[PDB]
Amino acid sequence: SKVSVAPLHLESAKEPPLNTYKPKEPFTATIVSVESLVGPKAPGETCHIVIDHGGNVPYWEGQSYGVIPPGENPKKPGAPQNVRLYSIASTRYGDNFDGRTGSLCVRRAVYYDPETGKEDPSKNGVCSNFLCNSKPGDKIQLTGPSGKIMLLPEEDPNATHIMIATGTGVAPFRGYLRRMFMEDVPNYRFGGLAWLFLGVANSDSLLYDEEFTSYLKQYPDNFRYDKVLSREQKNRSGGKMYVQDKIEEYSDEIFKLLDGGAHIYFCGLKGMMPGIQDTLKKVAERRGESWDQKLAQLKKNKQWHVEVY
Amino acid sequence: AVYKVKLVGPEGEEHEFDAPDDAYILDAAETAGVELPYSCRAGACSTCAGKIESGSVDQSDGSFLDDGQQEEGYVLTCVSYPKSDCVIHTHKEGDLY
Numbered sequence: 001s002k003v004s005v006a007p008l009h010l011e012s013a014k015e016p017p018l019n020t021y022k023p024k025e026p027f028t029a030t031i032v033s034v035e036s037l038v039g040p041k042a043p044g045e046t047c048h049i050v051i052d053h054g055g056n057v058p059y060w061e062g063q064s065y066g067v068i069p070p071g072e073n074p075k076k077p078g079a080p081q082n083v084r085l086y087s088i089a090s091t092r093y094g095d096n097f098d099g100r101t102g103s104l105c106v107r108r109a110v111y112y113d114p115e116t117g118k119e120d121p122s123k124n125g126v127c128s129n130f131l132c133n134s135k136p137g138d139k140i141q142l143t144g145p146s147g148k149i150m151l152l153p154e155e156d157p158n159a160t161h162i163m164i165a166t167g168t169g170v171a172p173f174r175g176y177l178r179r180m181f182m183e184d185v186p187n188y189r190f191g192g193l194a195w196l197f198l199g200v201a202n203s204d205s206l207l208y209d210e211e212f213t214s215y216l217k218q219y220p221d222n223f224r225y226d227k228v229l230s231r232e233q234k235n236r237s238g239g240k241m242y243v244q245d246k247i248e249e250y251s252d253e254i255f256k257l258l259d260g261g262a263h264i265y266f267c268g269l270k271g272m273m274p275g276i277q278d279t280l281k282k283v284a285e286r287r288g289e290s291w292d293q294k295l296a297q298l299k300k301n302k303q304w305h306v307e308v309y
Numbered sequence: 310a311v312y313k314v315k316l317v318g319p320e321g322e323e324h325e326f327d328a329p330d331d332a333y334i335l336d337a338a339e340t341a342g343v344e345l346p347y348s349c350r351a352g353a354c355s356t357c358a359g360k361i362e363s364g365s366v367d368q369s370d371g372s373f374l375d376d377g378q379q380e381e382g383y384v385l386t387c388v389s390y391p392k393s394d395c396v397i398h399t400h401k402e403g404d405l406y
């Protein structure tokens with residue numbers, strides 16, 4: 001059975017909220033919790049942060065939050081830190097089915113001398129460490145919400161959605177999937193095909209596996225889930241396994257869906273796209289199609305959704 | 310005050326619409342049925358990059374462009390407030406590096 005969520009009036013809005021809070025006057029939110037999502041073998045830490053906005057900074061799935069870390073811009077004295085954007089990883093109701101909180105999936109950005117391999121704390125990510133270092137009760141300068149590119153197309157409750165993600169790129173999909181399968185949303189009964197491809201470094205780096213594996217059990221006919229552990233698996237030629245390699249294992253199947261009107265999304269660091277595109281190019285050609293033309297058509301049909309950074 | 314913002318596509322296509330001085334140009338344009346390129350929509354990238362011909366805007370809510378790029382006339386339309394009538398050329402992301 002699905003989890004009851006409230007308040008339902010959060011379904012009433014016709015247009016998504018945008019820029020409810022700007023940098024000059026951010027909303028002061030409160031940290032509800034912070035937990036590491038990875039094991040000891042993960043290259044670095046990625047944490048789950050729950051934030052209490054009290055219903056003041058509501059949002060729609062696929063959107064992001066702005067966070068302004070304390071201190072002054074190191075590049076502009078007297079000026080506050082630039083806002084860092086973070087893809088909201090929770091549905092509009094939040095992990096509390098409250099409609100009161102939202103969540104972020106934050107990768108800790110750290111610096112290591114290319115040689116001595118020693119970390120220089122003075123050179124690591126300000127906002128990401130600030131976030132993952134937070135404790136219950138800490139205040140956070142919140143801006144937004146923002147974005148429209150990753151809004152989930154709901155006109156067709158039986159539409160097909162192929163989700164390709166790497167690292168923190170899984171964030172918006174965690175939002176989609178809770179909405180399609182875990183939450184009891186009367187006006188959105190997903191009955192299509194949700195397919196999630198997630199590529200990470202190793203299994204200790206998997207993000208929300210118990211959650212996604214859970215959908216594979218509850219909705220075998222509506223959810224497909226393929227993982228790629230780059231530092232533990234290998235592709236056909238012996239090199240590290242990447243998401244495009246897993247996408248390749250289902251090339252014909254994936255192109256059918258796209259040809260049938262399926263939506264495809266990409267999210268995570270931008271260095272994931274080059275390989276993805278090359279693989280798509282080679283797959284379209286092994287089928288006799290022009291990739292440039294197909295991309296142009298997919299975009300035309302509003303089936304192509306990218307949120308890399 | 311509400312100004313008139315005139316946009317120029319990468320092929321001479323033009324669009325002139327009302328733009329409140331307290332509304333981002335990207336939003337003022339979409340209100341008038343004008344489709345413009347965008348990504349983050351929060352002044353963190355260059356996808357919405359544009360270049361001033363005449364007029365001025367306040368895009369301090371943005372942080373992707375450096376002083377030099379802004380000196381040349383480049384503006385992030387998703388976080389730009391028109392400060393007067395302007396003429397802006399769209400799809401300039403390709404000029405940024």
Ligand SMILES: Cc1cc2nc3c(=O)[nH]c(=O)nc-3n(C[C@H](O)[C@H](O)[C@H](O)COP(=O)(O)OP(=O)(O)OC[C@H]3O[C@@H](n4cnc5c(N)ncnc54)[C@H](O)[C@@H]3O)c2cc1C
Nearest residue numbers: 084085086087106107109123124125126127128168309353
């Ligand atoms: C639309 C959008 C969505 C995003 N979604 C997510 C998300 O869901 N999860 C996520 O984790 N991130 C996301 N990001 C990225 C995020 O906004 C930040 O860019 C990221 O967390 C790094 O910010 P930071 O403040 O930690 O680091 P910054 O201080 O900005 O530093 C950037 C890099 O410079 C390094 N550095 C700093 N000083 C030095 C020095 N002196 N020498 C050498 N290196 C140095 C840092 O260690 C770091 O790796 C998103 C970005 C956008 C635009």
Ligand code: FES
Nearest residue numbers: 348350352353354
């Ligand atoms: S869409 Fe990214 S800065 Fe405007």
